[PDB]
Design a protein around this ligand. Structure first.
Ligand SMILES: C=CCOc1ccccc1F
Length: 162
């Protein structure tokens, strides 16, 4: 297991424009296109992202390339953020995957606001961090995915994904 396999499980793969759990137009392995209600706006974002006129449909290779870009962007956002980087650098490799997963789903600004959870994680207070992480809109709205991520932070294993 690695961050790509973990997020591929959590996000799935769809080659045509779909809606995420919040109702926003998305494609591929969880690539957000726009928060606008306009499908045309989403299609315009897609064509810009891929570099051709896609008509709302991409190939598996294109989905995987977008996914690589999106994972890298999440990592870069962690490493550029003064609140996230010290916590990330304190974690082992498996827990770093859980951190990237959260930033992929909610963005660096949103995750950087999880101030108390971040402190507990940096202190390696795993059970307390897990309890605190579940006291969130994130957990209530996507509980099965949040439970897998939280279990990864709690245990430092891939048990929730096996
Ligand atoms: C608040 C939970 C997410 O945890 C992290 C996210 C990004 C970087 C480091 C982390 F520990």
């Amino acid at each position: 297991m690695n961050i790509f396999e973990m997020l591929r499980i959590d996000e799935g793969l769809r080659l045509k424009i779909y809606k995420d759990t919040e109702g926003y137009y998305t494609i591929g392995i969880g690539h957000l296109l726009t928060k606008s209600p306009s499908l045309n706006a989403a299609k315009s974002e897609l064509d810009k992202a891929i570099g051709r006129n896609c008509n709302g449909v991409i190939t598996k290779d294109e989905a995987e390339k977008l996914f690589n870009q999106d994972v890298d962007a999440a990592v870069r956002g962690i490493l550029r953020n003064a609140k996230l980087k010290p916590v990330y650098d304190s974690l082992d490799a498996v827990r770093r995957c859980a951190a990237i997963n959260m930033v992929f789903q909610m963005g660096e600004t949103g995750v950087a606001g999880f101030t108390n959870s971040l402190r507990m994680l940096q202190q390696k207070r795993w059970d307390e961090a897990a309890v605190n992480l579940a006291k969130s809109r994130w957990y209530n709205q996507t509980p099965n995915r949040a439970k897998r991520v939280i279990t990864t932070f709690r245990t430092g294993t891939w048990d929730a994904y096996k």
